[PDB]
Protein backbone atom coordinates (compact mmCIF):
# COMPACT_ATOMS: atom_id res chain seq x y z
CA UNK A 1 0.00 0.00 0.00
CA UNK A 2 3.02 2.26 0.47
CA UNK A 3 3.66 2.08 -3.28
CA UNK A 4 0.10 3.02 -4.23
CA UNK A 5 0.17 5.77 -1.61
CA UNK A 6 3.39 7.18 -3.01
CA UNK A 7 1.90 7.16 -6.52
CA UNK A 8 -1.30 8.93 -5.45
CA UNK A 9 0.79 11.46 -3.49
CA UNK A 10 2.68 12.24 -6.70
CA UNK A 11 -0.54 12.70 -8.68
CA UNK A 12 -1.99 14.90 -5.94
CA UNK A 13 1.08 17.14 -6.02
CA UNK A 14 1.13 17.40 -9.82
CA UNK A 15 -2.53 18.35 -9.82
CA UNK A 16 -2.03 20.94 -7.07
CA UNK A 17 1.00 22.55 -8.68
CA UNK A 18 -0.52 22.63 -12.18
CA UNK A 19 -4.18 23.33 -11.34
CA UNK A 20 -5.09 20.30 -13.47
CA UNK A 21 -6.45 16.88 -12.44
CA UNK A 22 -6.37 15.19 -15.86
CA UNK A 23 -3.86 12.46 -16.75
CA UNK A 24 -3.56 10.28 -19.83
CA UNK A 25 -2.85 6.59 -19.20
CA UNK A 26 0.69 6.81 -20.58
CA UNK A 27 1.36 9.88 -18.43
CA UNK A 28 0.37 7.86 -15.37
CA UNK A 29 2.78 5.17 -16.56
CA UNK A 30 5.62 7.66 -16.93
CA UNK A 31 5.07 8.95 -13.39
CA UNK A 32 5.11 5.39 -12.08
CA UNK A 33 8.39 4.74 -13.90
CA UNK A 34 9.96 7.87 -12.38
CA UNK A 35 9.00 6.54 -8.92
CA UNK A 36 10.45 3.09 -9.73
CA UNK A 37 7.06 1.47 -9.28
CA UNK A 38 7.16 -2.00 -10.78
CA UNK A 39 3.89 -3.94 -10.89
CA UNK A 40 2.85 -7.05 -12.77
CA UNK A 41 0.09 -5.25 -14.68
CA UNK A 42 0.03 -1.49 -14.84
CA UNK A 43 -3.42 -1.33 -16.46
CA UNK A 44 -5.07 -3.13 -13.56
CA UNK A 45 -2.95 -1.31 -10.98
CA UNK A 46 -4.58 1.83 -12.38
CA UNK A 47 -7.90 -0.01 -12.48
CA UNK A 48 -7.60 -0.77 -8.76
CA UNK A 49 -7.08 2.93 -8.07
CA UNK A 50 -10.21 3.61 -10.12
CA UNK A 51 -12.10 1.03 -8.04
CA UNK A 52 -10.88 2.72 -4.85
CA UNK A 53 -12.12 6.11 -6.11
CA UNK A 54 -8.88 7.95 -6.74
CA UNK A 55 -9.27 8.04 -10.52
CA UNK A 56 -12.37 8.36 -12.66
CA UNK A 57 -12.31 7.45 -16.35
CA UNK A 58 -12.98 10.20 -18.88
CA UNK A 59 -12.88 7.89 -21.85
CA UNK A 60 -10.84 4.71 -21.82
CA UNK A 61 -7.42 6.40 -22.04
CA UNK A 62 -7.80 9.46 -19.78
CA UNK A 63 -8.43 9.79 -16.07
CA UNK A 64 -9.48 12.52 -13.66
CA UNK A 65 -7.86 12.48 -10.24
CA UNK A 66 -10.33 12.80 -7.34
CA UNK A 67 -8.51 14.99 -4.83
CA UNK A 68 -8.74 17.98 -2.54
CA UNK A 69 -6.59 20.94 -3.50
CA UNK A 70 -5.40 24.10 -1.80
CA UNK A 71 -5.40 26.66 -4.62
Curated annotation (Swiss-Prot):
<comment type="function">
    <text>Component of the MCM8-MCM9 complex, a complex involved in the repair of double-stranded DNA breaks (DBSs) and DNA interstrand cross-links (ICLs) by homologous recombination (HR). Required for DNA resection by the MRE11-RAD50-NBN/NBS1 (MRN) complex by recruiting the MRN complex to the repair site and by promoting the complex nuclease activity. Probably by regulating the localization of the MNR complex, indirectly regulates the recruitment of downstream effector RAD51 to DNA damage sites including DBSs and ICLs. The MCM8-MCM9 complex is dispensable for DNA replication and S phase progression.</text>
</comment>
<comment type="similarity">
    <text>Belongs to the MCM family.</text>
</comment>
<protein>
    <recommendedName>
        <fullName>DNA helicase MCM8</fullName>
    </recommendedName>
</protein>
<comment type="subunit">
    <text>Component of the MCM8-MCM9 complex, which forms a hexamer composed of MCM8 and MCM9. Interacts with the DNA mismatch repair (MMR) complex composed at least of MSH2, MSH3, MSH6, PMS1 and MLH1. Interacts with RAD51; the interaction recruits RAD51 to DNA damage sites. Interacts with the MRN complex composed of MRE11, RAD50 and NBN/NBS1. Interacts with CDC6 and ORC2. Interacts with HROB; the interaction recruits the MCM8-MCM9 complex to DNA damage sites.</text>
</comment>
Amino acid sequence: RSTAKRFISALNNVAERTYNNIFQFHQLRQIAKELNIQVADFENFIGSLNDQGYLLKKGPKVYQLQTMHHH
